[PDB]
Amino acid sequence: VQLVESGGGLVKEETQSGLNNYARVVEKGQYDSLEIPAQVAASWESGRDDAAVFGFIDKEQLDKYVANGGKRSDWTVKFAENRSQDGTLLGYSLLQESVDQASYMYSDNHYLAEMATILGKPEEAKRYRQLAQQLADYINTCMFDPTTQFYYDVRIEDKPLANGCAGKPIVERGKGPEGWSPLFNGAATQANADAVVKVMLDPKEFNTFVPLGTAALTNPAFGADIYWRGRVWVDQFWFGLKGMERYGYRDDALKLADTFFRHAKGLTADGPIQENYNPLTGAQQGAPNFSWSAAHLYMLYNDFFRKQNADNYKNVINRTGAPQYMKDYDYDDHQRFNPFFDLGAWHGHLLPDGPNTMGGFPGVALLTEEYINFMASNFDRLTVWQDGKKVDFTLEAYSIPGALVQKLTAKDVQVEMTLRFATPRTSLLETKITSNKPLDLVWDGELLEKLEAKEGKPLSDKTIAGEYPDYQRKISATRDGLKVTFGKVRATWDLLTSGESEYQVHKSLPVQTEINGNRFTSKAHINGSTTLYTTYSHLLTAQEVSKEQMQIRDILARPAFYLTASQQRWEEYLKKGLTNPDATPEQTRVAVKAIETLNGNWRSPGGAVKFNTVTPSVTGRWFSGNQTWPWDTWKQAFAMAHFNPDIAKENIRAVFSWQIQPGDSVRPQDVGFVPDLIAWNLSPERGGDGGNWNERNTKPSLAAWSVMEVYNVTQDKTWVAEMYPKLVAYHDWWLRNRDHNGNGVPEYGATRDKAHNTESGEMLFTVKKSLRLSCAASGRTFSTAAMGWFRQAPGKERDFVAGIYWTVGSTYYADSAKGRFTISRDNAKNTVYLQMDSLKPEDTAVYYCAARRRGFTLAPTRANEYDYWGQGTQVTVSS
Numbered sequence: 001v002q003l004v005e006s007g008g009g010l011v012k013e014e015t016q017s018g019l020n021n022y023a024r025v026v027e028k029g030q031y032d033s034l035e036i037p038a039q040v041a042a043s044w045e046s047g048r049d050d051a052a053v054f055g056f057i058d059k060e061q062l063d064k065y066v067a068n069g070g071k072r073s074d075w076t077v078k079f080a081e082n083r084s085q086d087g088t089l090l091g092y093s094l095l096q097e098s099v100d101q102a103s104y105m106y107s108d109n110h111y112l113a114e115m116a117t118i119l120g121k122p123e124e125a126k127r128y129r130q131l132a133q134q135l136a137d138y139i140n141t142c143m144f145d146p147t148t149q150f151y152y153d154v155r156i157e158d159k160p161l162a163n164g165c166a167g168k169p170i171v172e173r174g175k176g177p178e179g180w181s182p183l184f185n186g187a188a189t190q191a192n193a194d195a196v197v198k199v200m201l202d203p204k205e206f207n208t209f210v211p212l213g214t215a216a217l218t219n220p221a222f223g224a225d226i227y228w229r230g231r232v233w234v235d236q237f238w239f240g241l242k243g244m245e246r247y248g249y250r251d252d253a254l255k256l257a258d259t260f261f262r263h264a265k266g267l268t269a270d271g272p273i274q275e276n277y278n279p280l281t282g283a284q285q286g287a288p289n290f291s292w293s294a295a296h297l298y299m300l301y302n303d304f305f306r307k308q309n310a311d312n313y314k315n316v317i318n319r320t321g322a323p324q325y326m327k328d329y330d331y332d333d334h335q336r337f338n339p340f341f342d343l344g345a346w347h348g349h350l351l352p353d354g355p356n357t358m359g360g361f362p363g364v365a366l367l368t369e370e371y372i373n374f375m376a377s378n379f380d381r382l383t384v385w386q387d388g389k390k391v392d393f394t395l396e397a398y399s400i401p402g403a404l405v406q407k408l409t410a411k412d413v414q415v416e417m418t419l420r421f422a423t424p425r426t427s428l429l430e431t432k433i434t435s436n437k438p439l440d441l442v443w444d445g446e447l448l449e450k451l452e453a454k455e456g457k458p459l460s461d462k463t464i465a466g467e468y469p470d471y472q473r474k475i476s477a478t479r480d481g482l483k484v485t486f487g488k489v490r491a492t493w494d495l496l497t498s499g500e501s502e503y504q505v506h507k508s509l510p511v512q513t514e515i516n517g518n519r520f521t522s523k524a525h526i527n528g529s530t531t532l533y534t535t536y537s538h539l540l541t542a543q544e545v546s547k548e549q550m551q552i553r554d555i556l557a558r559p560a561f562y563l564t565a566s567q568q569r570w571e572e573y574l575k576k577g578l579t580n581p582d583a584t585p586e587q588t589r590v591a592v593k594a595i596e597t598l599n600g601n602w603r604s605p606g607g608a609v610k611f612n613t614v615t616p617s618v619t620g621r622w623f624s625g626n627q628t629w630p631w632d633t634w635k636q637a638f639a640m641a642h643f644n645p646d647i648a649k650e651n652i653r654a655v656f657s658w659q660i661q662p663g664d665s666v667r668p669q670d671v672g673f674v675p676d677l678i679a680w681n682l683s684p685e686r687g688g689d690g691g692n693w694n695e696r697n698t699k700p701s702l703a704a705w706s707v708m709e710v711y712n713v714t715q716d717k718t719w720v721a722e723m724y725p726k727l728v729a730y731h732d733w734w735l736r737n738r739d740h741n742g743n744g745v746p747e748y749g750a751t752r753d754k755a756h757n758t759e760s761g762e763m764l765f766t767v768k769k770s771l772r773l774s775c776a777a778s779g780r781t782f783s784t785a786a787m788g789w790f791r792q793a794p795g796k797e798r799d800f801v802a803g804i805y806w807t808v809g810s811t812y813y814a815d816s817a818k819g820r821f822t823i824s825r826d827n828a829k830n831t832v833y834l835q836m837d838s839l840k841p842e843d844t845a846v847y848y849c850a851a852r853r854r855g856f857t858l859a860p861t862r863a864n865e866y867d868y869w870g871q872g873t874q875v876t877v878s879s
């Protein structure tokens with residue numbers, strides 16, 4: 001007896017259009033078979049990818065939810081188009097008003113009124129106070145649930161409730177951090193706040209090992225490892241504490257801060273700052289050198305941590321390493337080393353790991369427009385020779401805020417190396433050699449060969465050069481050092497170069513330099529103690545290569561000036577930043593890690609971005625170059641206000657510099673909109689070749705809060721005057737384009753976009769193609785008896801799908817197959833079929849045919865009741 005399955009594999013997709021067609025599919029019962037690009041983008045606009053509140057819940061969680069009394073349809077989020085009175089297409093909204101977004105809008109209004117007051121505009125202040133009070137009434141009437149004493153999003157139902165609310169609170173999707181958003185933002189009444197704080201401090205809800213995670217323990221879609229449905233983020237934790245303090249519970253906030261300090265793993269160690277924590281174990285996850293984590297850790301230092309010159313802070317972050325791959329990635333594709341970047345520069349350096357890399361600063365990290373890529377292991381590494389024997393050194397190497405230092409000590413030679421940044425394109429190394437005898441010096445370097453590793457293991461046998469033939473890396477000796485030139489590479493997702501970018505080495509000492517393919521050696525002879533100065537410059541355009549030469553000449557002429565400028569700027573960061581007298585040494589050191597992190601993620605202007613900016617992570621797979629987000633920015637600038645206010649202001653400016661103005665070429669219906677993602681390269685719709693520039697959605701709005709924080713530390717009236725109209729245009733944009741029911745209470749949404757609609761304005765959506773599986777039986781005919789389909793997901797039981805039985809060919813289906821799957825038989829062919837329509841990712845599994853010859857009383861539906869099995873066939877359905 002043999003059963004042979006056929007017809008599996010990756011299921012294909014088909015694009016459809018039309019909001020009317022979409023509604024007909026929802027009506028049919030088949031919501032779960034749809035992917036709508038605009039709705040995916042609205043989840044990006046919320047800033048919480050797969051939060052429970054937006055309908056995201058996995059199969060096993062949903063089964064349990066139903067077993068507890070709930071319906072699967074309780075997780076469906078409907079979607080609508082937003083049109084003006086003219087009929088113009090404005091965008092799209094979730095049919096759901098979010099309490100965190102209502103509270104942000106409350107804050108927007110509150111801070112805008114303060115700004116109008118500062119600016120002597122009392123009637124505008126009156127408008128903004130009125131809008132705030134209206135929003136607070138809606139939030140406290142509509143979004144607060146008296147039974148569960150907490151806040152939730154509401155649906156936009158077919159008609160409003162008797163009291164005017166768009167719909168009932170979505171209590172059944174469970175509690176999340178959005179519940180304390182009214183407290184943080186100050187919209188909550190005192191009674192409602194008291195109720196919320198009690199839930200926050202409940203050990204059954206949020207008061208976990210690391211408290212205030214992204215879903216309460218009681219949330220049906222909670223998982224301790226899910227980014228947005230259980231894990232703890234520093235922003236929402238801090239919002240939580242601030243909200244508590246706002247309504248009289250500073251004492252308890254202080255207790256939670258202490259808990260967090262004791263339990264968040266690695267806080268007092270030397271690893272990079274990451275994204276989030278498991279609420280049960282405190283284990284860390286996410287991109288290293290993560291800006292908004294640094295920002296909120298700094299704000300916690302400032303507000304909540306307490307006891308219960310750059311030399312004082314060595315090795316706060318481990319910056320050692322010896323990369324062997326251009327993309328030497330961790331498990332989540334982030335660079336697994338922590339290079340030192342300063343001054344907004346576009347290249348960075350590591351400390352030598354041991355004597356193998358000693359005498360150099362290994363792993364030149366290059367920021368190639370939008371990505372971080374390692375160029376070399378050793379590059380310009382010094383070795384010292386006497387009579388043809390290499391001098392043996394002891395290594396000591398450390399980082400401090402603003403510098404890398406290495407000291408090499410031998411019996412009769414000492415070398416002291418100090419690396420600091422000099423301009424936003426140039427770093428400067430001082431190499432001080434002490435010797436009473438002549439020496440031969442040798443510098444060596446090698447460009448990397450291997451492309452990609454993940455967790456130290458090569459992903460393939462691919463080479464940099466094989467993968468990117470346009471890169472054309474070439475080392476040349478120069479007048480006063482060496483350069484590496486690069487070809488034009490437009491690898492949208494990986495590596496971006498102009499064709500005119502260069503990495504230049506200039507030295508104060510004359511050296512003779514030999515190139516041997518991807519290697520170089522430079523030699524010089526010295527007759528005793530010598531100090532030399534070396535500049536390293538990553539230059540991204542012909543104009544930059546040109547402009548930097550004069551600067552490079554200046555740095556080599558005035559090295560003491562530039563080294564001192566760096567040391568003193570960093571003394572100012574620590575002096576302004578370390579303002580908590582009641583902090584322990586360990587807490588203070590956490591603040592210094594945050595300062596180093598944020599200043600590392602600062603980029604100088606580049607390509608389309610005309611201002612200094614700060615990105616979520618210089619080492620991040622998708623967060624590097626000068627890629628800038630609004631949401632990350634507001635948080636970054638709130639904290640950078642307190643230690644580097646000039647870059648705080650720049651960061652906010654960079655984001656507003658691409659705000660939509662009347663007469664815009666792409667989206668004139670979006671005046672006041674702030675794009676989700678700006679970067680070096682403009683989108684093709686704007687005449688560039690960039691793939692990251694994103695205007696399909698914005699992010700939640702903490703812009704007024706962030707601008708006001710810069711005012712609270714500077715009291716600069718010209719700053720408020722500058723920002724206030726940009727803030728007003730953005731505020732107004734939400735009310736034109738993200739308010740489907742026009743009640744003045746925003747929804748998360750998406751813009752009209754090439755990704756979202758056809759030229760004529762018909763909303764795009766995607767459905768999977770039908771897939772048919774077949775099972776050819778060999779040996780005994782089963783048309784009298786039983787044939788069935790089972791499935792099993794990775795590490796799960798074999799679960800019944802559908803069966804066909806007896807002469808008459810009666811059928812039976814799993815509830816999850818009903819409506820979608822159709823089993824059938826060709827008795828002549830001894831073959832059974834399964835037609836699978838309305839597939840969804842939950843259906844990914846190995847599918848097995850099975851058969852039973854022996855008589856049965858009732859149609860067999862359980863694995864152990866079948867007697868023959870095919871080998872299985874994988875079907876994959878991806879989102």
Ligand SMILES: [Ca+2]
Nearest residue numbers: 739741745746
């Ligand atoms: Ca609304």
